[PDB]
Structures are given as structure tokens and as C-alpha cells.
Design a protein around this ligand. Sequence first.
Ligand code: CLA
Ligand code: CLA
Ligand code: CLA
Ligand code: CLA
Ligand code: HEC
Ligand SMILES: CCCCCCCCCCCCO[C@@H]1O[C@H](CO)[C@@H](O[C@H]2O[C@H](CO)[C@@H](O)[C@H](O)[C@H]2O)[C@H](O)[C@H]1O
Ligand SMILES: CCCCCCCS[C@@H]1O[C@H](CO)[C@@H](O)[C@H](O)[C@H]1O
Ligand SMILES: CCCCCCCS[C@@H]1O[C@H](CO)[C@@H](O)[C@H](O)[C@H]1O
Ligand SMILES: CCCCCCCS[C@@H]1O[C@H](CO)[C@@H](O)[C@H](O)[C@H]1O
Ligand SMILES: CCCCCCCS[C@@H]1O[C@H](CO)[C@@H](O)[C@H](O)[C@H]1O
Ligand SMILES: CCCCCCCS[C@@H]1O[C@H](CO)[C@@H](O)[C@H](O)[C@H]1O
Ligand SMILES: CCCCCCCS[C@@H]1O[C@H](CO)[C@@H](O)[C@H](O)[C@H]1O
Ligand code: OEX
Ligand SMILES: [Cl-]
Ligand SMILES: [Cl-]
Lengths: 153, 243, 58, 97, 336, 51, 153, 51, 137, 34, 30, 37
Amino acid sequence: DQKLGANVGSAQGPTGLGKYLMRSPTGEIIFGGETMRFWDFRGPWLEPLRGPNGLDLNKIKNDIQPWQERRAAEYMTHAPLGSLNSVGGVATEINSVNFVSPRSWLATSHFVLAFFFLVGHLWHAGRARAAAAGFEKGIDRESEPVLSMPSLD
Amino acid sequence: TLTYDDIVGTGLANKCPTLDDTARGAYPIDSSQTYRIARLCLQPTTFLVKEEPKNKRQEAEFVPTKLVTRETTSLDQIQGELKVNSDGSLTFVEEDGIDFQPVTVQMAGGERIPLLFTVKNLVASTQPNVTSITTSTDFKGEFNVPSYRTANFLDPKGRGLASGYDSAIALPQAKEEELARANVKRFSLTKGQISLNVAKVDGRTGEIAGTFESEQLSDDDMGAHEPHEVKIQGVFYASIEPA
Amino acid sequence: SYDFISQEIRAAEDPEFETFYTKNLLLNEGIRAWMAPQDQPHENFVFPEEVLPRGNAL
Amino acid sequence: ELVNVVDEKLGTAYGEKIDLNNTNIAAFIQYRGLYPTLAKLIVKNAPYESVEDVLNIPGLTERQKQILRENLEHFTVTEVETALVEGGDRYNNGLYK
Amino acid sequence: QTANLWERFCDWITSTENRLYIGWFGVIMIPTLLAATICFVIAFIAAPPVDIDGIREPVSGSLLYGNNIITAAVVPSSNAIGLHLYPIWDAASLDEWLYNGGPYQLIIFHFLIGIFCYMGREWELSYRLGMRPWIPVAFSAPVAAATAVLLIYPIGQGSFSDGLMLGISGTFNFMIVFQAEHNILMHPFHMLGVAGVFGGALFAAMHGSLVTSSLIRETTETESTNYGYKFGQEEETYNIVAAHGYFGRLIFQYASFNNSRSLHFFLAAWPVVGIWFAALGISTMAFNLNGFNFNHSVVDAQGNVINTWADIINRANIGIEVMHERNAHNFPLDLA
Amino acid sequence: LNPMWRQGMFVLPFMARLGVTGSWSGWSITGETGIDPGFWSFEGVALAHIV
Amino acid sequence: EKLAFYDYIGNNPAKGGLFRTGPMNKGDGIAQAWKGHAVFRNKEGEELFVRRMPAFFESFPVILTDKNGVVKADIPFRRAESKYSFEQQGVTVSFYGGELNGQTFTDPPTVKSYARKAIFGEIFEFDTETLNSDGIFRTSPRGWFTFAHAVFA
Amino acid sequence: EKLAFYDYIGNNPAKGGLFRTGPMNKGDGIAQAWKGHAVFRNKEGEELFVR
Amino acid sequence: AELTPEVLTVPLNSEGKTITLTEKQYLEGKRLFQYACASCHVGGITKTNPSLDLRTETLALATPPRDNIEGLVDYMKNPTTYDGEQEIAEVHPSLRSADIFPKMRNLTEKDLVAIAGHILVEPKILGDKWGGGKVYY
Amino acid sequence: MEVNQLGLIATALFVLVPSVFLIILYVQTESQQK
Amino acid sequence: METITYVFIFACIIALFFFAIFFREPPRIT
Amino acid sequence: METLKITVYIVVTFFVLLFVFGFLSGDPARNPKRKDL
Ligand code: CLA
Ligand code: CLA
Ligand code: CLA
Ligand code: CLA
Ligand code: HEC
Ligand SMILES: CCCCCCCCCCCCO[C@@H]1O[C@H](CO)[C@@H](O[C@H]2O[C@H](CO)[C@@H](O)[C@H](O)[C@H]2O)[C@H](O)[C@H]1O
Ligand SMILES: CCCCCCCS[C@@H]1O[C@H](CO)[C@@H](O)[C@H](O)[C@H]1O
Ligand SMILES: CCCCCCCS[C@@H]1O[C@H](CO)[C@@H](O)[C@H](O)[C@H]1O
Ligand SMILES: CCCCCCCS[C@@H]1O[C@H](CO)[C@@H](O)[C@H](O)[C@H]1O
Ligand SMILES: CCCCCCCS[C@@H]1O[C@H](CO)[C@@H](O)[C@H](O)[C@H]1O
Ligand SMILES: CCCCCCCS[C@@H]1O[C@H](CO)[C@@H](O)[C@H](O)[C@H]1O
Ligand SMILES: CCCCCCCS[C@@H]1O[C@H](CO)[C@@H](O)[C@H](O)[C@H]1O
Ligand code: OEX
Ligand SMILES: [Cl-]
Ligand SMILES: [Cl-]
């Protein structure tokens, strides 16, 4: 849009926030739209545009190199979104692009594994306690602890 | 000099640069040379809203408000031509920059006042015979205040100006004239006024700083209700360069 | 159980009033307009691009 | 009374041709040779009192002036509408595919 | 003595005689659940509107601000906050904290700590009572599901503004947007989830009906049959051989449980595993590994797409996609 | 022209009579704005009675 | 008038709601008179027909076709690429029979208002004040009888 | 305006009814502004006073 | 419906010469288009610049004309803006910039012809769905 | 909010009538000879 | 009046919880 | 806000310390059977 002549610093979006650039809750200049949530992101293709106040409008207007445009287009079009049968893109995308990011494969697998291993911890920790105390096979009918406790009421 | 990682999350990124107490000099103006403001920064410190009383005879007052949208309020990286006029006055013609911020403040009792704090299309002029910018120099001018939402914005029932429904579709057989003000969106364009009081000048570097007061209308919700009058006070910083 | 009448009266008069109930109706309106031509082919719906309800950009 | 100014514009030449003072820049793709180079210059140098004022944009090449002349029949001008030109909307009006 | 007074405290904390067991997990559970409950109740009734999507468009969630029980919610913290922790003391004022959805973060973080400690507390009391230890393993299934929608999904998407909204209509909003953004209906872990809850309901009705069907006659025609069982009696109250004889004939003999321990393990395992998979569905769609996409999978000899029911689903998904958060997107892809 | 006694207020004057005059929301019954009542606002009094 | 009134969707029993209580008059109002038959034309004088609302739809777009079903006008949502707006197509409406017999309207907001009523079929004037009607359709005793007896059955 | 408003019988507590429920504002309305002091005169210009 | 020689006959140049693609050519073009182009041009649109699509009528109004094999092959060697004024190989994949777009490095003349033929044939099959975006899904 | 004016009485009787039925039955069970 | 109604019903439910737990019929072995 | 922050930090630290020292206080022996754990 800047190549087309837009003044991206002064462009007010539909909500009143900047369509391209806005402030984080502590004032840093950041990208606008829904990506306001991602302003903690840092990467080598973007940091040349960042100054002490956040994104530098002078550097944005004058110093974006073609390799940065290339990298941003590449990364926008390889976002880590895709289907289980490896159809790349948002869920409404049509078939064409065979893509699921390695980041998605590695994050999902290791959440699944970490979760069941927490279940295994609970299983074996509870069993080890019960076995050390001698009741992992059940309650002794002739010595049921609750029968020796005062009723709650 | 601080870097981004020195600054991030502190709130300092919403503050304009300041000048030392030693900056009480004079920036000479050469009437044959062309000038620009390379950077203008405006940092609001107080938002006041004029009360709307019932009697409409007593003078309504501007009252304090509570900012609820955090440290997102400052205007910066603003630039434009600094013209030297026939009478020796200077005129700043704003051309580009981060020259607006949506802001919501809250009145006592909870009423929220959104506004588009802005100096868009500012043209502001000094007194005549400014052979040098000094701490006695002042800028006075007017700017545009466009609609707080732009034309695509859709209300919670999906109605809008350049997009959206043109009626209250959930009330299919209601009479429409009573809903005209909510159904037919309108795009406000009003004027604001601002004064810049120069309090500090670095004659060597061309930097100035001081206080400002601006007055403008708040959000009218695309014509759904009357806007409120807002007074904004704060500090400013500007860097002047030959061009 | 499609609507709450009091919600619709308030939202129609007050374009700043929004709840999760009004947000979900906008989704429903999207479902109806975008799925009906292919889902109800006997109706021969032709909805020109310009009439389809949609938010910004998407 | 209250009127939707965008719908009103659709009843003017804005609804029939590319309005050099209001129409979003993507409309210049409709004709050969106008986008993006001339389209940028046209939006940057708006508004125009008449369509043929587009020929006076400073810095146009001779071929660009010829290209513009071939396309004046597809252009119009109406009064600037604030709702269509604020927000940077002439450069990105929130519509993609 | 310090050691005696501390041991008296430990004995009271871990006492099997407290009407409600406290325990060491309870020492964390009780203050966090109280903080979450009190904040939730106050916010549900009285909180002002919250700018969930960070676009200065506050959504009203509370009863006093125009909601009923079905539409009210505690609204997530602002998209401008993202995953930043937003405690009260980081706000300039309570007014700011409320506008930005502070209550939601306080509630969900105290709630999650509280239910994890509730789970540990189930282990703890079973240990004090001489029980076997795996009731908290069953409860880990709902805990995992709550954690998926309140914590993992917002982490994956970069914002608590996309976590489950704490209200009835807010839940439906979360579900419908989720379907457009992940095609969860076409994800096999959600399918396993559905089998878990459909099957759990089925097996509950089945087990309930079979035991009820074979209660031994112990009451007169007037009184409820429930009086035929006395709390703590040693003998079984129904004829499991009669129950098995019915069910083995209903299907076939070897399809029926005659071992009550196997039967009750199955009753535990089926819904629990199903909900584990449901929770893993949300927790892996949190990183955008989404449901099956068969959009335009069927193509004729020339190359025309022949639609399937998957394509009709896609049209509904698109309708949700283009309408949701209608003022929040400026660029053509919804990438989180 | 719209004080509490025009509005059917019954307990509000009893809080005000003994010195509770401000709301946490920033107003006071004498028409002030931006006041800080501390905990003992009208709302704090109500909360204390409920507890 | 009685025949025209049957050709109106506000009398269709599948247009109601479970908790929209009371008489049909409480929704669209107490019908007073037929306004007459609306005939829509574009600036070339071709007659256009408003696409009627099926019972399934709580809301429905405004689309006008010629006698062969070709779209000729509509009420757009997004305006920036509108081709079929009533303003671009010069849509007018003339009434035959009823209250408005012999009248022609050309003001686009007025023409569009009548087009929005035409998706419901024949157009009526209603008293919406006597019952404080809310403009939302209710079912008839045909609908309520059917519901109660299918549920009880 | 506050002094004039006290000199108005709609604020007199002996003007009510046992079953006229709610705030005073529900009767004469929510007071907005003093209309000013009415001075009546006859055609000879003598000032007259309403009983 | 069938993928006939007539469907596979597309303009070779602006002068009106045609070429009849083989079924193998078209299928190779479809595969190579997925390999090198679909990440941005899936379905005939352009994800990083939706204003410009791959519809034949759009290509016909580009400068120089891109609605024919030679025009599209030339574009894949030396892409320009829509008005032909500016060379954009630094930001658009091409043989000229195969150093920075490595998926172009091994493409032969035959490969470019196949990709071009796919782009021209696909709207003959799909009509307005090619370049249509989600409205036409 | 412009709610239905019968919603209050509907909810009140919906709660009160069956709750009272149960309270009647409970209390007269307690008072029976034990 | 509708907010009062919703909060009233909620409050009655919380009170019921209290009585159901602390004033239950005590379970008794016989 | 600063007083609230300190208060909450102390409260959180207090309950977490009770939890840690509590479970350190010979918790294996707090069971009805083998208490020589
Ligand atoms: C950390 C584990 C891990 C991860 C992240 C990956 C990731 C990947 N693999 Mg590898 N792989 C793995 C382990 C892994 N793999 C193992 C163990 C094998 C031996 C079978 C392989 C053999 C293999 C081959 C041969 C290929 C891949 C390929 C790939 C890519 C495509 C994946 C795909 O389509 O899956 C499809 C998804 C499924 C089949 C879903 C499986 C769902 C499981 C059953 C859920 C299990 C839940 C849990 C583990 C069990 C709980 C039970 C409960 C009761 C306790 C992707 C990058 C492909 C590739 O592109 O290579 C270049 C490819 O061809 N992988
Ligand atoms: C069990 C007691 C408990 C716990 C664990 C929490 C936890 C929390 N509170 Mg809550 N709170 C509590 C009781 C508790 N609260 C009570 C009784 C009140 C009324 C006074 C409150 C009032 C309150 C308010 C008003 C707020 C919080 C907030 C928070 C969050 C931030 C806290 C923080 O920054 O700590 C500071 C961090 C430290 C002090 C360091 C940790 C100290 C330990 C010793 C280090 C070990 C930690 C590490 C994870 C190891 C864990 C070991 C494990 C085995 C236990 C966190 C979820 C904030 C919030 O919800 O934000 C959204 C917030 O605004 N709390
Ligand atoms: C066959 C039964 C029946 C039917 C079909 C009708 C039909 C009609 N009535 Mg009549 N009416 C009836 C019986 C019926 N009535 C009875 C028994 C009475 C005495 C109470 C009345 C008194 C009455 C009055 C005073 C009025 C009507 C009116 C009307 C008209 C409006 C209907 C409406 O708004 O309902 C609305 C329907 C609902 C809101 C649905 C209620 C659903 C309930 C609450 C579900 C309960 C669920 C339950 C709690 C779940 C338990 C779960 C548990 C097992 C676990 C319609 C023609 C109105 C009219 O226009 O008159 C001219 C009107 O004013 N009726
Ligand atoms: C000393 C007690 C007292 C007083 C002086 C007030 C005063 C006020 N109230 Mg409050 N209120 C009270 C207690 C009180 N209230 C209680 C206990 C509640 C809970 C129910 C409320 C809840 C409440 C609400 C919700 C509202 C008020 C409002 C008001 C204002 C309007 C009052 C009105 O219209 O009354 C009308 C009084 C009557 C119609 C008289 C009733 C006489 C009874 C019915 C006679 C019964 C006779 C008996 C059956 C015969 C037995 C015979 C037998 C022995 C043989 C007024 C400032 C209103 C206001 O403006 O708020 C801002 C308002 O909305 N009050
Ligand atoms: C994103 C990273 C892209 C990839 C990969 C490919 N193309 Fe592209 N294409 C892209 C953009 C941003 C544009 C517009 C550039 C501009 O400023 O004009 C294009 C344009 C084309 C065109 C011209 C379309 C027209 O209507 O005139 C063609 C013919 C084209 N692209 C073809 C093409 C091929 C064959 C590709 C793979 C080899 C390919 N593109 C990759 C973005 C991207
Ligand atoms: C990664 C960070 C690491 C930081 C450093 C961590 C150091 C940890 C040091 C652990 C010190 C343990 O301190 C431990 O506390 C309690 C105090 O009553 C004692 O616990 C004791 O409690 C009661 C008596 O009151 C007995 O029933 C119990 O059997 C006994 O163990 C332990 O016997 C003591 O040893
Ligand atoms: C005991 C629970 C107390 C709940 C306190 C609610 C916030 S306080 C509340 O805020 C409103 C909006 O700002 C004001 O209009 C109102 O006057 C004020 O009382
Ligand atoms: C009288 C106002 C009419 C509406 C004018 C809208 C577009 S004014 C807009 O202002 C910006 C600076 O804020 C500049 O960046 C941009 O070049 C200019 O077009
Ligand atoms: C149950 C919640 C308790 C919240 C406590 C907030 C204390 S707030 C505190 O209160 C004092 C009251 O006199 C004031 O004087 C003081 O200025 C104020 O800061
Ligand atoms: C049950 C928990 C409810 C706790 C509410 C405590 C409010 S505390 C209250 O907040 C106001 C905010 O402006 C301040 O003016 C005031 O000083 C402070 O005491
Ligand atoms: C701006 C109003 C245009 C005049 C004609 C409008 C269509 S007709 C109109 O429709 C209303 C329901 O919407 C009825 O209540 C009313 O009786 C009827 O006159
Ligand atoms: C040298 C004689 C001139 C005609 C033959 C050479 C140009 S031929 C020309 O090739 C262009 C791409 O290079 C396309 O734009 C065009 O459609 C095609 O006809
Ligand atoms: O925020 Mn809630 O929702 Ca997950 O996508 Mn993106 O961000 Mn928004 O859009 Mn779609
Ligand atoms: Cl949404
Ligand atoms: Cl966006």
C-alpha cells in the first residue's frame, strides 16, 4: 500500500486505530490489525525497521529492502496453519498446497505426549503411594479404615 | 542513548523527548531558506470533557476524566513544511505522521467518552516577525477531526455506511422512521483548535519543546448521538530543519 | 428460540450496545447467506457478490 | 433529513466511471496501462476540477499523457466525499477478493 | 514448641474428620477458588463492557448492563494485551482494568490453579482413606478440557482474547468461530470426544437400566424400591446373574459383562479417554493442526469440482469466517 | 434539581448524613467529580453490610 | 384485499418463534389496508421482480430479477464494488390497486423501503401503535395448535 | 435555581398519596430548569399575585 | 464433460496463433504450478496482492499482454508490474531471479510453457471460479 | 431493557408453585409419627 | 427487575447448596 | 496499587510455603495402613 502512495503512519483504520501502525499498551509503535497481539515478536527481517520507540516510520518509508519484502511474503504464505491431511492454509482453503508447518507437527505431537505423560505421572505416583502403604489391591474387608472413623455427621 | 530493549514495556515509548533546563536559546530563522519540522511529538497529560448541564444557562465546565485505554495516546513522527510568511511569521503545514490516536476516557459515574485525538491537516502559525524561534514563540492553528470510525465500520447489528445493512433486520416489520438516526450512518468532519506554547529552545540543534492545549469534538458514533467537547493538555517536542 | 426481543430493541436503537448474543446472530447471517445457494439448490439462489454480508477484509 | 452519502454517490457518475476524486485505486486495473504507476500519481494529485485536469499532473511523461487521453472516456470527477477518502481508503478500502 | 504446634496444624489440615477435607492441595485450592468465584459473581452481575478484541469496541457482558442469564458472560481480556499478564496492580485504575478485561484473567488463572488442586485433593483424601488412587485420573479428563480452552488455545493463538468466554452465549461464540478456523467437526479427536460423551450417556443409561431392572424384591407395593437397599449393607442389592442373562440375550452372550470390576473399569475408561481426546483436539488445533480438509477433493473427468457434503460444510465455515469480529481484520488472511 | 430526595432514595441520605458522600465511580452527592472516597464509598458501605 | 393478504409472509405460520407470544398483530401490527401491488422497473423500463423470502430465513437480501431470472438490481452490503444498486440502475416502483394505486416513487431510499417489504409478498399498511407491536413475526393458531399436539403426542 | 425549587409545592412532603408509589420524579417529572419568576399584570398595569 | 483438445487449445501469441497442449503437458503444468506458484496463486488469485489475479481477461489487459503462452513465459522470465513500467524480479519468482527464488532454478523452457498452458486452460474448465476467491469456493 | 411484562409473574409462579408443593410434602412427612 | 430476578434465583441455589451439604440427612449404617 | 501488589505477593508466598512445608512434613506416613513410610 505504501508503494501505491499510502501514508501508512496517518492511515486511520475502520475502528479508529491505525490500519497499519498503532501503539502497544505501553506506547511502542507496532503493526495494526489483529496482529496487535503479536507485537512481542522479534525476527531478523523485521528488527532493521525497529528503533527505540518501536517501528520507525522513517525507516519504514525509506529503508525496506527487497529481501525483506521477499521474506515477509514467504512467511505470510507459509503461516503454520493447515489440515490434518496436510492441506495448507486456513480451514476454508481449497485443496492445492500440500503444507503443514514443522512447527505445528512438533508442537502438537509434543503436547499430546506431554499430556499423557502427566497422566502417567498421576497414575504411577498414586499407585506407588498406595503400594508403599499396602492398599493398592483394595480395602481390607476386616480392617476398613472408614469403619473406624467417626461419622461426619 | 536507549535502545528498544531498554524501553520496551516501561511506558517511555508513549513520552515525547524533552529538553534540558539550559535550552533557553533562540533558533535563527533565515527568511530566504526553506524549513521543515522533521519531527513533531504531542504527549497528552490531561483530558477534560465539558459537562452538558440541563439548565443550559449556566456556563458548563470542563471536568477531569480517567483514561482507560492505557499509554496509547501520543502523536509522533509528524512532519511538514515550515513556511516563512511575508510578515516574518512561521506557518507549519502538517503533511504526514502518526497524527491521531483513538482514546477513551471516563467521566465520574462511568460514562465513556471515545475521541479521535488528532492534529490531522494541522496548519498552525506564529506571531509576525519571528526572526528567531524563542521561548516567547507560540503556534496557533486549526486541524481536521474526521469521524472516529471510518466508513467501513459496522455496528453490532451489522449496519454501516460504506458497508453493512441499511436497516434493523431483526425488526423486519418495525416502522423505520423512528430508527433513522441509528440506521442511516453519517460521517462527521469537524474542526479542532490547538495552541503550542514554546517553553524551551535549543538554538544550536533546532529542537523546541513546550506545552499545548487543543480543543475538539469527541466520537459521535457515526451520527448516532451528539459529540462532547474535549480539551486536551500536554507537552510537545519538535525538531526543525532547513529543507 | 431465535431471538431475545428486548436485546433487539436495545441494539436497534443503540449502535454501541453489543453482547455475545448479537455477535452470534451475525455469524448466523453469514452461515445463511454463504451456504444457502449450494445447500438449497432447488431455490436457484443467485446472490451477487455485493449483497453477501461480510466484515472488513475477510 | 439523514442520507447515506455513499449510496447517494452511486447515483452520480461515481457509480458509472472511475471518479478521479474518490474511487479506490484498485479500480484503475480495469483498463490497460493505468496501474500502478499512473494510478498512484492520480490519487496522489487529487482532487481535480475536471477530468482533463488529470493531464496536468506534474512530471508525467509524454506516453503517460497519451495513455491518460485514451482513458479519459472512462474517468469522471465528482465532489470529494470525506467518507470515501479518509482512512487511506483510496489506497486500501478493506476489500480484497 | 514450634514442632508441636506445627504438627498440630498438619494433623488438622490432613484430618479425615473435617466435614470437608482440606489437605495440602486444599490449602491452595480454597483461596484460589474463592477469589475466582467472588470475582466471577461480581463481574457477571455488574462489570461494565470489555474491549475483547482490542479495537475499542466494548462488549457488554454483565446483567446490570443489559444481559440476561443466557447472554451474560465475563468477557476475555483485550487483544491488545495478548498473552501479557494483566493483574490489577499493572492497571492505572480499576476503571482501566475493567475496560480491558482484567476480571477474566483473575478468574481463569485462579480457577485453573483451583481445579488442578481439586484434582490433587482427590488423590490426597483417597490416600488418607486407604482407597485406590485413580479417581483424579478420571477427573483429569474435564480438567484437561478446561485447560485446553482457557489456557492452551489462547497460548497457541497468542491471546487470551481468543480463550473461552465465560458465559452461555459466549461459549457458543467460541464454538462457532472455532469451527470456521479449525473445522473441528472434521477433526478425529473431536469425533472421539463425541463418541466419548454419546457413549458415556448411552452406557450410563444402559448400566443404570440393567441394575434397576434386576433389583431384588425387598419392598412392598406402596414404598419406593429405594428402601430395599440400606446404606452399608454387605449383600448386593440386584441379581447380576439375572442382569447378565438379559443383556447377553439382548445382543449375544459374550458381548455382555459378567465381571462387575471389568464393567465398571469400562464405564470409567470410555468417557475419560473420549474426553482426553477431545481436550487434545482443542490443544492441538491450538497450534493450527486442523480438521480434515476435503474441500474440492472430488473432481470430474474435465476438472470440474463435484461438491461433497464436505464442501457444504466449507460454505458454512466461510459464512462464519467472513462475519466474525467484523471490524477487526485489515488484511486478507485470518492467521490467528 | 434532581437530588436524592426527588428520586425516592431512602438509605442514601442516611449514609450521607454521617459522612459517606462519594462513589467509587468518581462522583459525590454534592456534585463533585474525580473524588477518591477510599473504601468507605456508598458501595463499600453496602459491601460491608452484605459481608 | 383478503386475497392479497393471504399472499403475505406475515401470515405464514412458519415465521414465528417459540417465545414470541400472543397474537400475530403483536408483531407486524394490526393490518389496516393493502397498499396495492408494487411493480418495480429500472431506468430502461424493464419490469423487475423482488426475490421473496423463504420461510427458513429470519433475514434475507433484496435482489431484483427480470422475468427470466437475470439479476438486474439489489441492495448492496459492501458498496465499493456495487454494480446493481437501485441508484445505478434507476429503480422505480409504481403501485396498482390498494391505497397507493396510480402512484410512482423514484427517491431511492423510498424505492428501497418498498423493495424490503416486497420480499414478504404483498404490501400492507399496519397499525403498530395500538398493541405496541414490535415488528417481529409470530405464528398463528395453526402453528401453536400443531406444536402443542405434536409435543403432547 | 436551588432556592426557587424549594419554593415549589411539588417538593412539599404533604402533597402525596398512600398508594402513589415511587420517586417524586414519577409525578410532576424530572425537574430540568427554572422557568423564571412569573409576574402577572392586568391591563392597567397593576401587579397581580396568584393565590 | 472431458478435457478435450479443443479445451487444451490456447493462444500462443497476440497475433492469433494457437497451440494445442497435450494432456501430459497440462498435467505437468498443473504440477509445476503447485510446486512453484500455488503458495501465492492458489485458485487463480494472488494472496500477497489480491488486486491482480490470473483471470484470462485480467492477463489480456496487462502490458505487455499476458493472455497467451509467449506472454506468460516471458513473464516467468522477466516479470513486470501490470502496466509494464517496472521490473519486479527482485520480489517475484522468475528465471531472472532464480538465485533468490530457488524453486525457479531448474525450470526449462518446456516447463514454463506447461505452467503458462495451465494458467490459460484452467478458467476454460472452471469459469469465474478461477480467480474468484472464497466467494466461488 | 424492554422485557415482557409477564416475565416476572411467570418466573415467580414457576418457582413458587412447585417449590411450595414439595415443602408441603416434606414438612408433613417430618411430622408423621416416627 | 429482571436482574433482581436472576440474582435472586442464583442466591436461592447457593443457599440450597449450603443446606444440602451441612443439613443433609446423615448417612447411617444399619 | 503498589500496596495491593505487595499484599498479594505476601499472600501467595504464604499459601505456597504452607503447601511445600506441609507436604514435606512426613506426608507418606499420613495414611491409615503402613505408617513407617
Ligand atoms: C515426534 C513425533 C513425530 C512428528 C512431530 C512427526 C512429523 C511428521 N512426520 Mg514423522 N514419524 C514418526 C514421528 C513423528 N513424525 C514416527 C514414530 C514414525 C514411524 C512410524 C514416523 C515416520 C514418518 C514417515 C514414513 C513420514 C513421516 C512424515 C512426517 C511429516 C508428515 C506427518 C503426517 O502427515 O502425519 C499424519 C498424522 C497421523 C497419521 C496421525 C496419527 C495420530 C496418532 C495415532 C495419535 C496418537 C496419540 C497418542 C500417541 C496415543 C495415545 C493412546 C492413548 C490411549 C494413551 C511430519 C513432519 C511424512 C513426511 O512428510 O516425511 C518427509 C512421511 O512420509 N513420519
Ligand atoms: C493459594 C493462594 C493464591 C495463589 C497461588 C494466587 C495466584 C495468583 N494471584 Mg491471587 N489472591 C489470593 C490467593 C492466591 N492467588 C487471595 C487470598 C487474594 C485476596 C487477597 C488474592 C487476590 C489477587 C488479586 C487482586 C490478583 C491476584 C493475582 C494472582 C496471579 C498473579 C500472582 C503473582 O503475580 O504472584 C507473584 C509471584 C511471586 C510472589 C513468586 C512466586 C512465589 C513462590 C514462592 C515461588 C514459586 C512459584 C513457582 C511457580 C513454583 C511453584 C511451586 C509449586 C510446588 C507450588 C496468580 C494467578 C493477579 C491476577 O489474577 O492477574 C491476572 C491479581 O490481580 N490475586
Ligand atoms: C393446546 C394448548 C394451547 C395452544 C396451542 C394455545 C394457543 C394460543 N394461546 Mg392459549 N391457553 C392455553 C392452551 C393453549 N393455547 C391454556 C391451558 C391456558 C390457561 C393458562 C391458555 C391461556 C391463554 C392466554 C391468557 C392467552 C393465550 C393465547 C394463545 C395464542 C398465543 C400462544 C402463545 O403465545 O404461547 C406461547 C408459548 C410458549 C411461551 C411456550 C411455553 C413452553 C413451556 C414454558 C415449556 C416448559 C418446559 C418444562 C418446564 C420442562 C420440564 C423439564 C422436566 C421434565 C425435567 C395461541 C393461539 C394468547 C392470545 O393471543 O389470546 C387471544 C393469550 O393472551 N392462551
Ligand atoms: C420504613 C420502611 C421503609 C420506608 C419509609 C421506605 C421508603 C421508600 N421506599 Mg423502600 N423498601 C423497604 C422499606 C422502606 N422504604 C423494604 C422493607 C423494601 C424491601 C421490600 C423496600 C424496597 C423498595 C423498592 C424496590 C423501592 C422502594 C422505594 C421507596 C420510596 C418510595 C416508597 C413507596 O412508594 O411506598 C409505597 C407504600 C405503600 C403503597 C404502603 C403499603 C401499605 C401496606 C400494603 C399495608 C398492608 C396492610 C395489611 C395487609 C393489613 C393487615 C390487617 C390485619 C392485621 C387484620 C420511599 C423513599 C421506591 C423508590 O423510589 O426507590 C428509588 C422503590 O422502587 N423501597
Ligand atoms: C508470492 C510469493 C508469489 C509467488 C510464489 C508467485 N507470484 Fe505471481 N504474483 C505475485 C504478486 C504480488 C503479483 C502482482 C505483482 C505486481 O505488482 O504486479 C503477481 C503477479 C503475477 C502475474 C501477473 C498477473 C496479472 O494479472 O497481470 C502472473 C502471470 C503471475 N504472477 C504468475 C506467476 C507464476 C507462473 C508463478 C510461479 C512460477 C508465480 N506467479 C509465483 C505473487 C507471487
Ligand atoms: C530449587 C530450589 C531449591 C531451594 C533449596 C531447597 C532446600 C530444601 C530444604 C528442605 C528442609 C526440610 O525441612 C523439613 O521440614 C519439616 C519441618 O517440620 C520436617 O517435617 C517434620 O514434620 C513433622 C513434625 O513436625 C513430622 O511428622 C515429620 O515426619 C517431619 O518430617 C522435616 O523433618 C524437615 O527436615
Ligand atoms: C458490593 C459490590 C459493589 C459493586 C460496585 C459496582 C461498581 S460502582 C458503580 O459503578 C457505576 C458505573 O461506573 C456507577 O454508575 C454507579 O453509580 C456505581 O455505584
Ligand atoms: C477537508 C478534509 C477532506 C478529507 C481529506 C481526507 C484525506 S487527507 C490526508 O491527510 C493525511 C495526513 O493526515 C495525508 O497523509 C494524506 O496525504 C492526505 O490525503
Ligand atoms: C474487601 C476489599 C478491601 C479493599 C480495601 C481497599 C482499601 S483502599 C484505602 O481505604 C481507606 C479507607 O479509609 C482510604 O482512606 C485510603 O485512602 C484508601 O486507599
Ligand atoms: C469483594 C471485592 C470487591 C473489591 C472492591 C474494592 C474497591 S477499592 C476502591 O476502588 C476505588 C477505585 O477508583 C478507589 O477510589 C478507592 O480508593 C478504593 O478503596
Ligand atoms: C420511510 C418509510 C417509507 C414508507 C413506506 C414503507 C414501506 S410500507 C410501511 O411498512 C411498515 C413496516 O416497515 C408498516 O408499519 C407501515 O404501516 C407501512 O406504511
Ligand atoms: C519481433 C516481432 C514482434 C512480434 C513477435 C515478438 C513479440 S510476440 C509477443 O510476446 C509477448 C511476450 O514477449 C506477449 O506479450 C505477446 O502477447 C506476444 O504476442
Ligand atoms: O480474535 Mn477472536 O478470532 Ca482467532 O482468528 Mn483471528 O483472532 Mn480473531 O479473527 Mn478469527
Ligand atoms: Cl465473533
Ligand atoms: Cl488483520
